[PDB]
């Protein structure tokens, strides 16, 4: 009697957002089933001259607003209920920042640490020849995800340029490519620049002077380093405590976010930094700082430490790092938490800015991409926050109101749902 299917969990979080908006009964049952599911058998030839058959998928949820966009997962524990759950989730993520996109996902049941470099070419090309009839530059756009990389996405583009016979924009069939084949700049600081702009406007919303505030960051990945690096130079906040999988440090007078990387590659972790205090992630979450931003695994700020939070703006940079029971405890104390698909939506805004470049054929520089991302994540926050001021719901539920209202209004104008 204990079964948690991922696709049923994505449906239950849609029926929650059906009550905060006036939506008909005929559009509620339209959004609960994806509109085209393809499951193919993908054969490769191995290294010893023998044949295997891996099982691939491709799920396209809802193309009402435009061409669908979604990553590619390579994982041995992939199921169709886990691909469809991220396929529904991709529709409310590309719509909340107002892109002309729909949701999608694709997966292959394989373990990529047991294939050679040549066999990863014969799999990445044979996946394209199986689902070429349901993708394209204006139909369905792949992207990189877990156990894929920019090295592989160049190969899927090459097999598309062989099948299409070069009669159309082939560089726009896939985003997240290398720079010298038709990629875009600003993809290394893509996700972390999204959280900087919304923090800059959330402190504007409270009326806070940001010149000298304090920030604690859980996790020190590529997102955790780039958030703390740009917090000193762009905004000006005093970096006081960063952490990783080992533990956390502490300095109430400032930190170098760049020389820490000089230590972390040299040593094993940021443990025993000179002029620091080795504390845990548990004390780091309940510190007294101005703004918290987790760049770590899910469910870090839970109901067992929700009352002890001393902060003002919470930026959920990860994919759902806050439990639903910790929402109502945080909401009454006077804290403002950013949704999971609103803070890190920069990885979809920058990946959309590549597809505009490849369709036109004119590549922008680092100044033009930073400027046009600055207007997108500013407007998408003041549609979400002002919706929270009108009906007085939590910021997690308030972003679900704006995300479905755009897709339902595009479904009603295309004539699909009359009422």
UniProtKB/Swiss-Prot annotation:
Active site: 105
Chemical reaction(s) catalysed: L-glutamate + NAD(+) + H2O = 2-oxoglutarate + NH4(+) + NADH + H(+); L-glutamate + NADP(+) + H2O = 2-oxoglutarate + NH4(+) + NADPH + H(+)
Any GO BP annotation: glutamate catabolic process
InterPro entries in the record: Aminoacid_DH-like_N_sf, GLPV_dehydrogenases, Glu/Leu/Phe/Val/Trp_DH, Glu/Leu/Phe/Val/Trp_DH_C, Glu/Leu/Phe/Val/Trp_DH_dimer, Glu/Leu/Phe/Val_DH_AS, Glu_DH, NAD(P)-bd_dom_sf
Class of the enzyme per the UniProt entry, highest EC level: oxidoreductase
Keyword tags: NAD, NADP, Oxidoreductase
Family: Belongs to the Glu/Leu/Phe/Val dehydrogenases family.
Subunit structure: Homohexamer.
Name recorded for this polypeptide: Glutamate dehydrogenase
Biological source species: Thermococcus profundus
